[PDB]
Design a protein around this motif. Structure first.
Motif, PDB file in Angstrom:
ATOM      1  N   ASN A   1      -9.411   3.368   3.324  1.00  0.00           N
ATOM      2  CA  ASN A   1      -8.363   2.837   4.167  1.00  0.00           C
ATOM      3  C   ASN A   1      -7.006   3.423   3.775  1.00  0.00           C
ATOM      4  O   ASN A   1      -6.167   3.716   4.623  1.00  0.00           O
TER       5      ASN A   1
ATOM      6  N   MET B   1       4.394   3.920   4.855  1.00  0.00           N
ATOM      7  CA  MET B   1       3.912   4.324   3.546  1.00  0.00           C
ATOM      8  C   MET B   1       4.601   5.556   2.974  1.00  0.00           C
ATOM      9  O   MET B   1       5.141   6.377   3.708  1.00  0.00           O
TER      10      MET B   1
ATOM     11  N   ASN C   1      -4.483   5.849   6.537  1.00  0.00           N
ATOM     12  CA  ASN C   1      -3.095   5.485   6.708  1.00  0.00           C
ATOM     13  C   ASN C   1      -2.212   6.664   6.320  1.00  0.00           C
ATOM     14  O   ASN C   1      -1.231   6.956   6.992  1.00  0.00           O
TER      15      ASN C   1
ATOM     16  N   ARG D   1       0.889  -1.147   0.000  1.00  0.00           N
ATOM     17  CA  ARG D   1       0.000   0.000   0.000  1.00  0.00           C
ATOM     18  C   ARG D   1       0.929   1.200   0.000  1.00  0.00           C
ATOM     19  O   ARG D   1       0.707   2.179   0.700  1.00  0.00           O
TER      20      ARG D   1
END
Ligand SMILES: *[C@@H]1O[C@H](CO)[C@@H](O[C@@H]2O[C@H](CO)[C@@H](O)[C@H](O)[C@H]2NC(C)=O)[C@H](O)[C@H]1NC(C)=O
Ligand SMILES: *[C@@H]1O[C@H](CO)[C@@H](O[C@@H]2O[C@H](CO)[C@@H](O)[C@H](O)[C@H]2NC(C)=O)[C@H](O)[C@H]1NC(C)=O
Ligand SMILES: *[C@@H]1O[C@H](CO)[C@@H](O[C@@H]2O[C@H](CO)[C@@H](O)[C@H](O)[C@H]2NC(C)=O)[C@H](O)[C@H]1NC(C)=O
Ligand SMILES: *[C@@H]1O[C@H](CO)[C@@H](O[C@H]2O[C@H](CO)[C@@H](O)[C@H](O)[C@H]2NC(C)=O)[C@H](O)[C@H]1NC(C)=O
Ligand SMILES: *[C@@H]1O[C@H](CO)[C@@H](O[C@H]2O[C@H](CO)[C@@H](O)[C@H](O)[C@H]2NC(C)=O)[C@H](O)[C@H]1NC(C)=O
Ligand SMILES: *[C@@H]1O[C@H](CO)[C@@H](O[C@H]2O[C@H](CO)[C@@H](O)[C@H](O)[C@H]2NC(C)=O)[C@H](O)[C@H]1NC(C)=O
Ligand SMILES: *[C@H]1O[C@H](CO)[C@@H](O[C@@H]2O[C@H](CO)[C@@H](O)[C@H](O)[C@H]2NC(C)=O)[C@H](O)[C@H]1NC(C)=O
Ligand SMILES: *[C@@H]1O[C@H](CO)[C@@H](O)[C@H](O)[C@H]1NC(C)=O
Ligand SMILES: *[C@@H]1O[C@H](CO)[C@@H](O)[C@H](O)[C@H]1NC(C)=O
Ligand SMILES: *[C@@H]1O[C@H](CO)[C@@H](O)[C@H](O)[C@H]1NC(C)=O
Ligand SMILES: *[C@H]1O[C@H](CO)[C@@H](O)[C@H](O)[C@H]1NC(C)=O
Ligand SMILES: *[C@H]1O[C@H](CO)[C@@H](O)[C@H](O)[C@H]1NC(C)=O
Ligand SMILES: [Ca+2]
Ligand SMILES: [Ca+2]
Ligand SMILES: [Ca+2]
Ligand SMILES: [Ca+2]
Ligand SMILES: [Ca+2]
Ligand SMILES: [Ca+2]
Lengths: 927, 599
Positions: free
Chosen positions: B313, A272, B317, A248
């Motif tokens: 989502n 991330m 994050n 991700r």
């Protein structure tokens, strides 16, 4: 740990060509002179109508500092028909990546566009060009009949490349299969052998290649970066590639097997958008012949002292062990926004110390984004995390950041000296620099005093002018040099000596050199071949007994030696340097004869005692331990008296206790020159006689599983007195104990149930939860808090089964969280009541039919637990009223535990036991 | 008394003061003395000489009361009490002071709508036409002032992201889809912030979508631009700001631009121009989260990530990395964009975190926060669950290690988002063995403290005998905004659960904890009965902040929700249902009219 930086080679390129964006060493076997390769992705060429196509310049190394562009292709754009071009070369970024394996060199243009024999496109598939001597073939694996973005139409193959030991090519193309990314490996030979000017899409034989995958992976960017090395038993380098957008955008690093191209290992990011994978490197950091992986995340955000998130990037350093698993560690940048792991680059043994080194670059750090490269040295234990050197870009911007370090190649000694070298390129300013390693020199110094103990009276040896006898003594300062590489012969050291350094300024220098009468003399030396320690002697006398009254403070001799800037080859000058961690000064001391009997010699009487006070080190947590040492001299003066405590590997020295009025504030310090782990304490250089001394040394033991019964310390006093210089080594142990605070807890979720009971239906032969009653639920936790853990325990849960052939809490099932297995003496869902498919108060086991659930417990360490999740059902037959008041019930269920086994076994234990209960009170409010 | 000052005074004034602020020095003309020259003026004064002995101090230099309403003529609506105060610290001393922060109701608000115009929004660009005036009212009743703007983005109009230029006739549309869409643009600025909340509707109406080959958009490019260009977007100096970032797609990050062949990093500077088109999209790489913050912060803009569930989502994050940023869940038609901006607004106005810009090096700053009447929670310096119009208090302590070089050295302190702030100009009035220290695990003062004679003099953001103990709480975090899950205290960056029978890094784990209900009962027994300990503690407002809304006869049926029942002081049985979901909304449906004994 030391590259020349005074005058380094400076190359340049056309204003705006991005000269320096890609670099590498060229070392043809056909010649003895190496060159340096520099890609100029944005240069302009004599290519027909090809504006900004890019180039690769071969730079010469020899004062001339010239670079003439390697001619890979002078051809403009090929045609598909009259007026409709087959390929577009302008703005292709040729040179964006440049590796060389030998007489051969790979050069790619990843912004190269193609229109395809099919429909009319302009797809950035990319293309490389492999040169070798004179024959120049064209490599272009992604340009095939498989067009468009769902295929290989947008690879930009050549975005990253590399060769393998067995001579092969690893080419990466980040755009393949909807930007998932691709890896392609072909044999150099097959590449030049299967070439053919008339076949835009060539089929190479043994070609390894990754395949397209599920859509989830779209936009990962496999091939963004790539490095090679072996990661299994033996054989050829396997493939390592970073995948920035992987996960991700956590980013991953893939390591594929180089023979069949199958997966071997993965690495994932932790934060991330950090751009994990932006770069990678394979090289052995700890000389264990096992390759080591380096991953850089140029945008990693860590936190500062104030705990605020800050961007400084980090470098993952995963060490590969024989096992196959990796033992990783981390390394964060220093300056914010500089982008640390922006460029990792393997050097060989930049200092020939026997271990390889690695360079990390923070392209936009220092001054005004001038750029910084940190070189890190490797060592057995791993990779030292403290930059041994810092290369500072010396070039200001002008339209965009200079970018010093965005690229850099190493592991090649483009010259004489048996030490590597390093190229670094700042494409913002259009240039590259070659830093040449200096020859490391290891040197040893000796320094000893003729007579150890100076006697005031006895004075043979007469002065200089006024022939007057005085108490002399000699100094012998010898020196040893020599290192590896190219440098020897010459080597000259400018030394210097001093008497009473413990005095320095402020006169009262009780010692002076013979013919000099000075407290300081100097000289030169010279040597070369290691072992030929050329000595030089001196003579020193002590002042007259009447010019000073200090006779305790030792007279220390001090010698400091430093090298001179003249022992370099005609390499336009290249002065070496001495081994980083190496002292340029040693010192020994002398003591005036005082109180040493009548034989004129001092011979002490040392003794160390240590009572076992605290005595109790519980295995598990970090237990604090302090011991009271009692050093005492019952003989004569002990010179350089010092307490020596040999500590255990499980213990670490805090400091000397001072929070007390009975202990001495000894000046201790921890060290370990020999794998002996020891703390040293000063007890007085002249350490007077009958000098008893109590003091406290506190620290912390960290035990270790199984192991033995107890950890011990070793104490002894060492002095520099020729006789009786030490004491009887007295040892002292401390037993390890076991403490495991284990406890049990329960909770009956609804610690209550009211019987008016919102609706309900007594359905003979029930089939679902609601047809039965509400969901009562007990939860039990067994948890070990105590430091020491255990390995086996029993769990006994008695449960309120029935009161009179009448069911109480109908258990539907139970679950477990942790190292535990449970068993029921009775089957749980006798009525198989699947889920919903749309002695008269406390009812315990003492007075009710019991159901026993037993559980065997595994190993629970400190701070862990096992958990039983029992999910029952209030059988609603708690219904009656025709007989007195059918009310108030306290449904009980208890659970006890027994700790049966610890993993120590050789240490005294005890049985941990306890229990607890949990109720579910059912009652009537609207009775 | 020959003590600390005595032992380290002989030298000269300089060092005499450099020892402790509990010392002093004295001597001028030619007055003699046989007693020490450096002492505690008390031990000294009874020995003559009497004025060279400074005392640290913090003089407020500007008060101005907190005001109770946004912009009301000349009165410079303030939200922070002291604005200026002068500190004058002497060697190694300290000085506490305080600060007040009010959530001034009816404060003007700015709202820049920055939507993603990827084909997957032609619809979206419809159920918004009305919005803008529809907004204007829900906003109106919560602020006597409202300005809105509009922005649009897609991605860098370059080869990889854009339709290179296959048919010469594709540089203009969605050629194969037929639809015929507007060409690629990156970031266009449409409607600058105005009060004529109709211009907004008369704008989106003209707006049309575009198309992009690659999945990920160029949103961040935009976010950076509608944040540092201000004169353009037209944010109001003294107002609350909102950047409503709405997209239904993934997003490019920094370093991606490499492919397109863009390697010059984002400078965070405004690059829009006359045509209102980010004129650097092609030459400059997308900005990183670090730059994004640094700028979002400086300009006092509140980024709101309005996104679709398929990619929600992802952005939660992402915000976790850009703190202070909230994330709502938009829809395929953005139909619900309305009641999203609101819940965002409020959610942001629900807290006050104090930040420190330009603090000096050797200066240490410890905080203590007071946000729930009298109850002070030592350590933190931020607060949540506050009601617009409420005030909070923070107690700051300043402390210098040593003494730098004179200079108007002045740093600030202010709430994240706020324009107001307390400038603090410090000034320093300053005119054994480093060896044996303590050693934690190999380092002198744990490598975090200086080692002067006796103990260590810890570095900013460190405390304790050794200086191992930090001053951080972030690690004590816990997804709740409540450090240690309200189950424990935070000491030295690590929580120490008060053992209610819980454990965990932030005490989040507590399997034997009483029924989820038992907890949320003291809740309904005040908000619906005034009774219960929770009203006694005079709280039940900052804590019990759910949504107790007495339900009709029957209770509910919503699965994934719990039921509960208890007996009140009154002896009747209350029935209630807990429930969480949606926007993350939690409400406590309470059956109305319990069950009491008849008679
Ligand atoms: C390479 O040559 C080109 C071509 O002359 C230079 O750019 C020209 O002018 C502008 C930039 O100033 C470009 O937009 C045009 O596309 C170019 N014209 C033509 C006919 O190609 C470019 O500046 C040169 N690049 C370098 C690094 O020197
Ligand atoms: C490394 O990660 C990759 C991607 O997450 C894994 O590759 C996938 O593996 C699954 C399982 O067979 C396949 O269905 C997919 O086709 C693979 N996708 C890609 C992009 O390769 C890989 O298996 C992982 N390897 C290890 C050792 O964990
Ligand atoms: C369920 O009822 C029992 C007894 O009615 C409670 O257990 C204990 O009862 C004795 C007798 O009055 C008290 O002295 C104890 O204080 C009670 N223990 C506790 C922990 O309160 C039990 O508590 C009841 N359960 C609930 C939820 O009230
Ligand atoms: C068993 O655990 C209990 C805790 O549940 C220990 O008992 C102490 O704490 C209880 C709290 O419920 C009290 O009821 C006890 O009176 C109290 N007793 C003592 C001596 O502290 C108990 O110590 C544990 N048993 C053992 C052998 O350690
Ligand atoms: C470093 O700081 C830690 C902070 O906790 C201290 O360690 C303590 O650890 C336990 C309490 O948390 C106690 O059992 C230890 O005795 C205590 N350490 C000492 C030395 O008493 C401690 O102050 C520092 N650690 C060390 C080794 O000095
Ligand atoms: C507890 O709350 C539930 C809400 O879920 C109530 O039951 C309703 O919801 C259930 C879940 O879908 C359905 O299965 C039920 O049929 C529905 N109730 C009705 C009348 O249809 C329930 O009333 C509550 N139970 C108790 C004991 O209070
Ligand atoms: C040589 O003596 C010591 C080295 O033995 C030098 O002093 C410091 O020594 C420590 C090691 O104990 C090093 O970490 C420091 O880096 C040294 N200081 C400096 C400035 O490098 C000392 O400098 C030398 N003495 C003389 C007279 O030159
Ligand atoms: C390559 O060969 C096969 C193909 O997958 C497999 O065994 C493995 O990936 C590699 N070799 C070995 C010995 O495993
Ligand atoms: C004085 O010291 C001893 C005698 O005590 C002996 O070495 C000699 O007699 C004198 N010195 C030297 C250097 O010999
Ligand atoms: C933190 O809290 C205390 C409350 O007693 C307050 O005085 C000060 O701001 C801080 N404490 C200290 C010792 O500075
Ligand atoms: C119970 O689970 C399995 C039984 O097959 C076994 O491997 C495991 O060791 C058992 N656990 C314990 C704690 O005994
Ligand atoms: C962030 O979202 C949640 C947070 O708990 C969780 O799924 C995970 O930590 C992250 N997931 C993704 C997709 O980023
Ligand atoms: Ca292999
Ligand atoms: Ca290795
Ligand atoms: Ca090395
Ligand atoms: Ca070399
Ligand atoms: Ca003797
Ligand atoms: Ca949509």
């Amino acid at each position: 740990f030391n590259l020349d930086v005074d005058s380094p080679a400076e190359y340049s390129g056309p204003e705006g060509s991005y000269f320096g964006f890609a670099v590498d060493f060229f070392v043809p076997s056909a010649s003895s002179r190496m060159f340096l390769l520099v890609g100029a992705p944005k240069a302009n060429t004599t290519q027909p109508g090809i504006v900004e196509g890019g180039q690769v310049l071969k730079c010469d190394w020899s004062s001339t500092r010239r670079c003439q562009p390697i001619e890979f292709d002078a051809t403009g754009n090929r045609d598909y028909a009259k007026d409709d071009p087959l390929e577009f070369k302008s703005h292709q970024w040729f040179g964006a990546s440049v590796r060389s394996k030998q007489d051969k060199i790979l050069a790619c243009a990843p912004l190269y566009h193609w229109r395809t024999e099919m429909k009319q496109e302009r797809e950035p598939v990319g293309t490389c060009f492999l040169q070798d001597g004179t024959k120049t073939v064209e490599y272009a694996p992604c340009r095939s009949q498989d067009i468009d973005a769902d295929g290989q139409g947008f690879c930009q193959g050549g975005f990253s490349i590399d060769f393998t030991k067995a001579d092969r090519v690893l080419l990466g193309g980040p755009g393949s299969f909807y930007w998932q990314g691709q890896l392609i490996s072909d044999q150099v030979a097959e590449i030049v052998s299967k070439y053919d000017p008339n076949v835009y899409s060539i089929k190479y034989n043994n070609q390894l290649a990754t395949r397209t995958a599920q859509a989830i992976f779209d936009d990962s960017y496999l091939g963004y970066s790539v490095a090679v090395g072996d990661f299994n038993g033996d054989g050829i380098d396997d493939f390592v590639s970073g995948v920035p957008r992987a996960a991700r955008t956590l980013g991953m690093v893939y390591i594929y097997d180089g023979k069949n191209m199958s997966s071997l290992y993965n690495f994932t990011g932790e934060q991330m958008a950090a751009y994990f994978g932006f770069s990678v490197a394979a090289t052995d950091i700890n000389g264990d012949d096992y390759a080591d992986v380096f991953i850089g995340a140029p945008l990693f955000m860590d936190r500062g002292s104030d705990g605020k998130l800050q961007e400084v990037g980090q470098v993952s350093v995963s060490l590969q062990r024989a096992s196959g698993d990796f033992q990783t560690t981390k390394l964060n940048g220093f300056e914010v926004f500089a982008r640390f792991g922006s460029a990792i680059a393997p050097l060989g043994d930049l200092d020939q110390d026997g271990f390889n080194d690695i360079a990390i670059a923070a392209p936009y750090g220092g001054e005004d984004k001038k750029g910084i490269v940190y070189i890190f040295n490797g060592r057995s234990t791993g990779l030292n995390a403290v930059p041994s050197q810092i290369l500072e870009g010396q070039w200001a911007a002008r339209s965009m950041p200079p970018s010093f370090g965005y690229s850099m190649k190493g592991a090649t000694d483009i010259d004489k000296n048996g030490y590597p070298d390093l190229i670094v390129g700042a494409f913002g300013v259009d240039r590259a620099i070659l830093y040449r390693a200096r020859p490391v020199i290891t040197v040893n110094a000796g320094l000893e005093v003729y007579p150890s103990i100076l006697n005031q009276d006895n004075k043979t040896c007469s002065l200089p002018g006024t022939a007057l006898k005085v108490s002399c003594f000699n100094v012998r300062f010898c020196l040893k040099a020599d290192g590896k590489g190219v440098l020897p012969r010459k080597l000259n050291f400018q030394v210097e000596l001093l008497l009473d350094k413990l005095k320095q300024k402020g006169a009262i220098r009780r010692a002076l050199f013979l013919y000099s009468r000075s407290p300081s003399h100097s000289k030169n030396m010279t040597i070369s071949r290691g072992g030929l320690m050329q000595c030089e002697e001196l003579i020193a006398y002590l002042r007259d007994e009447s010019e000073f009254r200090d006779k305790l403070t030792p007279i220390t001799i001090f010698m400091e030696y430093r090298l001179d800037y003249r022992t370099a080859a005609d390499t336009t000058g290249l002065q070496p340097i001495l081994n980083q961690f190496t002292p340029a000064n040693i010192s020994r001391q002398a003591h005036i004869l005082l109180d040493c009997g009548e034989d004129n010699v001092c011979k002490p009487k040392l003794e160390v005692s240590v009572d076992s006070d605290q005595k109790k080190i519980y295995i598990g947590d970090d237990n604090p331990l302090t011991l009271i040492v009692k050093a005492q001299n019952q003989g004569e003066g002990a010179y350089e008296a010092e307490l020596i405590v040999s500590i255990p590997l499980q213990a670490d020295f805090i400091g000397v206790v001072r929070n007390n009025e009975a202990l001495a504030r000894l000046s201790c310090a921890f060290k370990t020159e020999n794998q002996t782990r020891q703390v040293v304490c000063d007890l007085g250089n002249p350490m007077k006689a009958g000098t008893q001394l109590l003091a406290g040394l506190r620290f912390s033991v960290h035990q270790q599983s199984e192991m033995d019964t107890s950890v011990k310390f070793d104490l002894q006093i060492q002095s520099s007195n020729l006789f009786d210089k030490v004491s009887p080594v007295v040892s002292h142990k401390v037993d390890l104990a076991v403490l495991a605070a284990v406890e049990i807890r329960g909770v009956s979720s609804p610690d209550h149930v009211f019987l008016p009971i919102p609706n309900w239906e007594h359905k003979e032969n029930p089939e679902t939860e609601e047809d039965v009653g509400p969901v009562v639920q007990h939860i039990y936790e067994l948890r070990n808090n105590g430091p020491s853990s255990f390995s086996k325990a029993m769990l006994h849960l008695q449960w309120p089964y029935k009161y009179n052939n009448n069911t109480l809490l109908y258990i539907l099932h139970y679950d477990i969280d942790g190292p535990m297995n449970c068993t029921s003496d009775m089957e749980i869902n006798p009525l198989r009541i699947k889920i919903s498919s749309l002695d008269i108060h406390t009812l315990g086991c003492g007075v009710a039919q019991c159901l026993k659930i037993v559980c065997q417990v595994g190993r629970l360490d400190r701070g862990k637990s096992a958990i039983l999740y029992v999910k029952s059902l209030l059988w609603t037959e708690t219904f009656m009223n025709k007989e007195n008041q059918n009310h108030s019930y306290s449904l009980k269920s208890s659970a006890s535990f027994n700790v049966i086994e610890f993993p120590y076994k050789n240490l005294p234990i005890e049985d941990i036991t306890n229990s607890t209960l949990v109720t579910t009170n059912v009652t009537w409010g609207i009775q | 008394g020959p003590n600390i000052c005595t032992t380290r005074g002989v030298s000269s004034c300089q060092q005499c003061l450099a020892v402790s602020p509990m010392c002093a020095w004295c001597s001028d003309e030619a007055l003699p003395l046989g007693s020490p020259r450096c002492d505690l003026k008390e031990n000294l004064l009874k020995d003559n000489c009497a004025i060279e002995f400074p005392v640290s101090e913090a003089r407020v230099l500007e008060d101005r009361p907190l005001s109770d309403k946004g912009s009301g003529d000349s009165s410079q609506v303030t939200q922070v009490s002291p604005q200026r105060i002068a500190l004058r610290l002497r060697p190694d001393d300290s000085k506490n002071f305080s600060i007040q922060v009010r959530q001034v109701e009816d404060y003007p608000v700015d709202i820049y709508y920055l939507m993603d115009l990827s084909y997957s929004m032609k619809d979206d660009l419809w159920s918004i036409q009305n919005l803008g005036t529809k907004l204007a009212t829900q906003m109106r009743k919560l602020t006597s002032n409202l300005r809105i703007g509009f922005g649009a983005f897609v991605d860098k109009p370059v080869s990889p992201y854009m339709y290179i230029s296959p048919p010469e006739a594709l540089e203009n549309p969605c050629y194969d889809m037929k639809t015929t869409c507007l060409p690629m643009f990156g970031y266009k600025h449409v409607l600058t912030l105005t009060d004529q909340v109709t211009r907004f509707n008369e704008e989106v109406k003209k707006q049309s979508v575009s198309r992009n080959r690659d999945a990920p958009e160029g949103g961040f490019d935009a976010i950076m631009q509608a944040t540092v260009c201000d004169e353009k977007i037209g944010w109001r100096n003294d107002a609350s700001h909102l950047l409503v970032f709405t997209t239904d797609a993934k997003t490019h990050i920094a370093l991606d631009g490499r492919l397109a062949g863009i390697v010059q990093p984002n400078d965070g500077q405004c690059h829009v121009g006359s045509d209102n088109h980010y004129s650097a999209s092609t030459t400059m790489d997308y900005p990183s989260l670090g730059l994004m913050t640094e700028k979002l912060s400086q300009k006092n803009i509140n980024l709101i990530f309005a996104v679709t569930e398929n990619v929600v989502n992802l952005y939660q994050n992402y915000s976790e990395l850009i703190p202070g940023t909230t994330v709502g869940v938009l829809s395929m038609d953005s139909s619900n964009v309305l009641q999203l901006i609101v819940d965002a607004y409020g959610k942001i106005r629900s807290k006050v975190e104090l930040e420190v810009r330009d603090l000096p090096e050797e200066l240490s700053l410890s905080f203590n926060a007071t946000c729930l009447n009298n109850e002070v929670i030592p350590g933190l310096k931020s607060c949540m669950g506050l009601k617009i119009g409420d005030t909070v208090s923070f107690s700051i302590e300043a402390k210098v290690r040593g003494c730098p070089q004179e200079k108007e050295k002045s740093f600030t302190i202010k709430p994240v988002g706020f324009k107001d702030s307390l400038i603090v100009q410090v000034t320093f009035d300053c005119d054994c063995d480093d060896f044996s220290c303590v050693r934690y695990k190999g380092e002198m003062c744990s490598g975090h403290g200086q080692c002067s004679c006796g103990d260590c003099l810890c570095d900013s953001d460190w405390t304790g005998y050794y200086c191992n103990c930090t001053t951080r709480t972030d690690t004590c975090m816990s997804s709740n905004g409540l450090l240690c899950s309200g189950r424990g205290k935070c000491e030295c960056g690590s929580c120490v659960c008060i053992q209610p029978g819980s454990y965990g890094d932030t005490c989040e784990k507590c399997p034997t904890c009483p029924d989820a209900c038992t907890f949320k009962k003291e809740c309904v027994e005040c908000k619906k009965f005034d009774r219960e300990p929770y009203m006694t503690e005079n709280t039940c407002n900052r804590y019990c902040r759910d949504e107790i809304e007495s339900v009709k006869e029957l209770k509910d049926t919503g699965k994934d929700a719990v039921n509960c029942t208890y007996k009140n002081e009154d002896d009747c049985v209350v029935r209630f249902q807990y429930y969480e979901d949606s926007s993350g909304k939690s409400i406590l449906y309470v059956v109305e009219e319990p069950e009491c004994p008849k008679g």
